[PDB]
RNA sequence: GUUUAUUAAAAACACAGCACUGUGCAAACACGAAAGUGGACGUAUACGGUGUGACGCCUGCCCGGUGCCGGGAGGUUAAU
C-alpha cells in the first residue's frame, strides 16, 4: 500500500471541488519515496517507504529511534 | 541541518564546526560516513565534551599510514602486461581495478577508489601517469607502463 | 606476382612505430615470396595541405614484387590501421631502385 | 530469389515469393528450440491489448545468440536456416570447442564461413566486437544499446546501423530510421548488414497469407458505430472528423514520444 | 471469404496491395489506482493507428478556416 512506515500516512479521500462546486471523489496520496537510510549502530542500509515528512521525522529523531518504533509496532524492513 | 563535523570538509568544515548544511547533503553524504553528526544536544555533549580531543588523535592515527605515501615510489613503475595488439592501441582498457591489484603488492591489500586518472582508463601501450589518493591530501603520482600479452 | 609501388603517409606521432610497421609489412610480403626492392622511409615530410587537421606527415615509399592477395591484404591493413594516412599502391611492372 | 507466382488462380495471381535455396530443408537444430505459444494479443488480464493478432501457424522459438559474448573462439557457419520469428534468417554456427549456436545471418554469410567475436577479432562481416575496435563509418548490425545487454538495433532483415562519429566514451549511430543515437562504445555490434535483404519484396498475394502469418482483419474506424470508435456513424461514408486512434488520440501526425530520460542520447530524430 | 443467431447476405465488412503518420526499445499503444502484462522473447525490411482497397492509366489547384508539426522574439497568463 501507499502507506508510510514512520508516519503511517495512508491515502485519504476528499472532493475535487471545481469552480462551480462540483464534488468528485479524489484521493490525496502521501509523498512516498523508497529511501535507503544508514544505520551506524547496525552499520548497514535499511530501505523504507517513507514520506517526506517521514524523512523529516527520522532526521529530527534518530534512525534508531524510528526503527525502534517500527519494531515495537510490528513493522519489517 | 545543524551538523557538527568530525573531519576537515573540503569547503564547509573545520573538524569541530556546528555548521548549517543542506539536509540532503548531511543525509546522503556526511552522516552515512563518519564525516559529521547531528548537533542537536546529545551529540553536542558527546563530541564537544567527551571525545572532541580523542577523535582528533584517532583521526591522526588514520592520517598516519596514509601520510605514508611510500607507494608513489613503492619500488617504481608498476608495469601491467595486458593482451594488446600491434600499433599500440590496446583494445580493452586496463581498469582502475587492474591498476590497484597490480600496484599494491599483489592485489588484495587496498581498495579500488584510490585511483585517479587524467586520461580516463587506458588507450595506449606505453607510459602513463596515474594519481592516487589514500588521503584527501595526497600528491600521489604513480607511474605505469603497459606491456603487450 | 606483379611489381607494385606503395607510398603511404603515417601520423607524425606513431613515427616511432614506422620501423615496426615497415618490417611487419615487408615480412608479410616476403612470407608469400614477395620481393621488396625499394624501402625508402622518407622521414617526416611537411604536407602541402592539412590532412585531418594535421600537417607534416611521415612518408614511406616501398617498391615490391608481390601477388595480388598479398597487396590486397596490405591495402586492408593500411585501411583498418588508424595511423596510416593516405596510402597509395600503384603498378610499375619493373624494378625501380634508384633514388627519391 | 524473388519469384512471381503464375496467375493460375486468384489469390495466387498477385503473389511474389522469396525462395532462398540455401535455407536448410530439414528440421532445425533441436537443443536450441523452445515452445512459443501464441497470445492472441491478450495480456495478463485476458483482454486484447494490441488488436489484429491471433491464429497463424505454430512456430518454435529459436534461441538466437544475440549477445555474441563468446570471445576469441572461432566459429564455422554450419548451416543457414529459416526462422519463423524473425524477418531475417538465422545461421547455426559451430565453435571450435564443440558448441552450436544460432546467430543472425548477415548479408555475406554462406555455409562454412569463419566468424568469431571478441576485442581482437577481424573486420569480416559476421564478426562481433565492441564499437571501439570497429572503425568509424563501417556498416554494422545487431548493435547493443548497453554493454553486455544483448543487441537490439539493426536486427531485422536487410537492416543495418552506421557508425557516424566517435566521441570518447560514446559512438554516434545513424539508425535505420535516420535518427542519430549515442550509445557507449563498449556496446557490441556485429559487422555487415543483416541477410534476407529481399524479404521486403514478398507481396503475400491474398488475405489468407496475412491470416496464417497471424494478422486478424483490420476494421476501419469509419466502418463502425459512434459507440465503437471515435470515427463512425454517418448515413453512408461520412467522416468530418479529425483522424484519431480508437481511444481518441490524434493520429496522422502527432508526436507521442515522451521519455525525457533517453533524450540525452538522441542527437537528432527521424526525418 | 465475412455479416444483422431469429424478416436485410448486399454494391455493406474483410482482403492482398497503396499511402500518411507515430514508435530508437523500459518503443509507441493498450489493459491495469499500481506491480505487472500484451506489443515481443519482436527491434524501423519491426510494430501501432488511420484512410483507400487487386491490377492498368493516374491522383490536378487551394494552408483562408479546424487540426497537426516547427519557432520563440514579443503581448497576455496560474500556483509561488
Ligand atoms: Mg493492426
Ligand atoms: Mg490493411
Ligand atoms: Mg479494413
Ligand atoms: Mg455500420
Ligand atoms: Mg464517441
Ligand atoms: Mg439507414
Ligand atoms: Mg451522404
Ligand atoms: Mg436474419
Ligand atoms: Mg452465420
Ligand atoms: Mg436471409
Ligand atoms: Mg472503402
Ligand atoms: Mg487530391
Ligand atoms: Mg497558415
Ligand atoms: Mg504550437
Ligand atoms: Na492550416
Contact criterion met (CB below 8 Å) for D124 and B95? no
Q: In angstroms, what is the resolution? A: 3.1
- D237 contact to strand E (CB, 7 A limit): yes
Q: Where in chain D is the domain with CATH 4.10.950.10?
A: 195-271
DSSP letter (8 states) at residue C55: -
CA nearest neighbour of D77 among D169, D195, D238, D179: D195
Residues of D with CB under 8 A from a CB of C: 123, 135
Q: Is B42 on the interface with A (CB under 8 A)?
A: no
Residue identified by cell 549477445 is D67
Q: Is C80 on the interface with D (CB under 8 A)?
A: yes
Complete DSSP assignment for B16-58: S---B--HHHIIIIITTTTSEEE-SSHHHIIIIIIITTHHHHH
* β-sheet with D161-167: strand ranges across: D128-130, D188-191, D139-141, D161-167, D170-174, D180-184, D266-268
Instruction: Count CB-CB contacts under 10 A for residue D254.
Output: 10
**Residues D92, D95, D96: CA angle, nearest 5 degrees:** 150
- D154 φ/ψ sector (left φ>0, alpha ψ -120 to 50, else beta): left
Residue B5 vs residues B2, B14, B146, D167, D216: alpha-carbon distances, Å: 10, 7, 43, 42, 69
DSSP letter (8 states) at residue C16: G
Distance, CA of C41 to CA of C37 (rounded, Å): 13
Record the cell numbers describing residue C97, joined without a space. 631502385
Contacts by residues B24-31 (CB-CB < 8 Å, ≥ 24 positions apart): B26/B1, B27/A55, B27/A59, B27/B1, B30/B3, B30/B5, B31/A38, B31/A40, B31/B3
Q: Which nucleotide is nearest to D63 (CA to C1')?
A: E41
* β-sheet with C58-66: strand ranges across: C35-44, C58-66, C2-10, C84-91
Contact criterion met (CB below 8 Å) for A39 and A46? yes
Pairing of strands C58-66, D16-18: unpaired
Record the cell numbers describing residue D74, joined without a space. 572461432
Distance, CA of B79 to CA of B103 (rounded, Å): 8
Distance, CA of C59 to CA of D146 (rounded, Å): 40
Q: Which CATH class is domain B69-148?
A: alpha beta
| Distance of CA D218 from the midpoint of ligand 3 (Å) | 4
CATH architecture of D1-113: Beta Barrel (2.40)
Distance, CA of D87 to CA of D66 (rounded, Å): 15
Nearest listed ligand to the Cα of residue D241 = 5
**Helix orientation angle between C18-31 and C68-80, rounded to the nearest 10 degrees:** 160
Q: Where in chain D is the domain with CATH 2.40.50.140?
A: 1-113
- Minimum Cα–Cα distance from B23: chain A residue: A59
Complete DSSP assignment for D244-260: B-TTS-B-SS------S
CATH architecture of D195-271: Irregular (4.10)
Pairing of strands B78-82, B143-148: parallel
CA nearest neighbour of C37 among C59, C63, C60: C63
- D164 contact to strand E (CB, 7 A limit): no
Q: How was this structure determined?
A: cryo-EM
Pairing of strands D61-62, A25-28: unpaired
Q: Which residues pair with D92 in a beta bridge?
A: D79, D102
Record the cell numbers describing residue D57, joined without a space. 501457424
Exposure string of D158-176, with b = 16+ CB inside 10 Å and e = fewer, is bbbbbbeebeeebbbbbbb
CA distance B86 to chain C (A): 9
Q: Is D133 on the interface with B (CB under 8 A)?
A: yes
Amino acid at each position: 500500500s501507499r502507506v508510510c512506515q514512520v508516519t503511517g500516512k495512508r491515502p485519504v479521500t476528499g472532493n475535487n471541488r471545481s469552480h462551480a462546486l462540483n464534488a468528485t471523489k479524489r484521493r490525496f496520496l502521501p509523498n512516498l519515496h523508497s529511501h535507503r537510510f544508514w544505520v551506524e549502530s547496525e552499520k548497514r542500509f535499511v530501505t523504507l517507504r517513507v514520506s517526506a515528512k517521514g524523512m523529516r521525522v527520522i532526521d529530527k529523531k534518530g534512525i534508531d529511534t524510528v526503527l525502534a518504533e517500527l519494531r515495537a509496532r510490528g513493522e519489517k524492513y | 541541518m545543524q551538523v557538527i563535523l568530525l573531519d576537515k570538509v573540503a569547503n564547509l568544515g573545520s573538524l569541530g564546526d556546528q555548521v548549517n548544511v543542506k539536509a540532503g547533503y548531511a543525509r546522503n553524504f556526511l552522516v552515512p560516513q563518519g564525516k559529521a553528526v547531528p548537533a542537536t544536544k546529545k551529540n553536542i555533549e558527546f563530541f564537544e565534551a567527551r571525545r572532541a580531543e580523542l577523535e582528533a588523535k584517532l583521526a591522526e592515527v588514520l592520517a598516519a599510514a596514509n601520510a605514508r605515501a611510500e607507494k608513489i615510489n613503492a619500488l617504481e613503475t608498476v608495469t601491467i602486461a595486458s593482451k594488446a595488439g600491434d600499433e599500440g592501441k590496446l583494445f580493452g582498457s586496463i581498469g582502475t581495478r587492474d591498476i590497484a591489484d597490480a600496484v599494491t603488492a599483489a592485489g588484495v591489500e587496498v581498495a579500488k577508489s584510490e585511483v585517479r586518472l587524467p586520461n580516463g582508463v587506458l588507450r595506449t601501450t606505453g607510459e602513463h601517469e596515474v594519481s592516487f589518493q589514500v588521503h584527501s591530501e595526497v600528491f600521489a603520482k604513480v607511474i605505469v607502463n603497459v606491456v603487450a600479452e | 606476382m606483379r611489381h607494385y609501388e606503395i607510398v603511404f603517409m603515417v601520423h607524425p606521432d606513431q613515427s616511432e612505430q614506422v620501423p615496426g610497421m615497415i618490417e611487419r609489412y615487408t615480412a608479410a610480403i616476403t612470407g608469400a615470396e614477395g620481393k621488396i626492392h625499394r624501402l625508402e622511409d622518407w622521414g617526416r615530410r611537411q604536407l602541402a595541405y592539412p590532412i585531418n587537421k594535421l600537417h607534416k606527415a611521415h612518408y614511406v615509399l616501398m617498391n615490391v614484387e608481390a601477388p595480388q592477395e598479398v597487396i590486397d591484404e596490405l591495402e586492408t591493413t593500411f585501411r583498418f590501421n588508424d595511423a596510416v594516412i593516405r596510402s597509395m599502391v600503384m603498378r610499375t611492372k619493373h624494378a625501380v631502385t634508384e633514388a627519391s | 530469389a524473388v519469384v512471381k507466382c503464375k496467375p493460375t488462380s486468384p489469390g495466387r495471381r498477385h503473389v511474389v515469393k522469396v525462395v532462398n535455396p540455401e535455407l536448410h530443408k530439414g528440421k532445425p537444430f533441436a537443443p536450441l528450440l523452445e515452445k512459443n505459444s501464441k497470445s492472441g494479443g491478450r495480456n495478463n488480464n485476458g483482454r486484447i491489448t494490441t488488436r489484429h493478432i491471433g491464429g497463424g501457424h505454430k512456430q518454435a522459438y529459436r534461441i538466437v545468440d544475440f549477445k555474441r559474448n563468446k570471445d576469441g573462439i572461432p566459429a564455422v557457419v554450419e548451416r543457414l536456416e529459416y526462422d519463423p520469428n524473425r524477418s531475417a534468417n538465422i545461421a547455426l554456427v559451430l565453435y571450435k570447442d564443440g558448441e552450436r549456436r544460432y546467430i543472425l545471418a548477415p548479408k555475406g554469410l554462406k555455409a562454412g564461413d569463419q566468424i568469431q567475436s571478441g576485442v581482437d577479432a577481424a573486420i569480416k562481416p559476421g564478426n562481433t566486437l565492441p564499437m571501439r575496435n570497429i572503425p568509424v563509418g563501417s556498416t554494422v548490425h545487431n548493435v547493443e544499446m548497453k554493454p553486455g545487454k544483448g543487441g537490439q538495433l539493426a536486427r531485422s532483415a536487410g537492416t543495418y546501423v552506421q557508425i557516424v562519429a566517435r566521441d570518447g566514451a560514446y559512438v554516434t549511430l545513424r539508425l535505420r530510421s535516420g535518427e542519430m543515437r549515442k550509445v557507449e562504445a563498449d556496446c557490441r555490434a556485429t559487422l555487415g548488414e543483416v541477410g534476407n535483404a529481399e524479404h521486403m519484396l514478398r507481396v503475400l498475394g491474398k488475405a489468407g497469407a496475412a491470416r496464417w502469418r497471424g494478422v486478424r482483419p483490420t476494421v476501419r474506424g469509419t466502418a463502425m458505430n459512434p459507440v465503437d470508435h471515435p470515427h463512425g456513424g454517418g448515413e453512408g461514408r461520412n467522416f468530418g472528423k479529425h483522424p484519431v486512434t480508437p481511444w481518441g488520440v490524434q493520429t496522422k501526425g502527432k508526436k507521442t514520444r515522451s521519455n525525457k530520460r533517453t533524450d540525452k542520447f538522441i542527437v537528432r530524430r527521424r526525418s
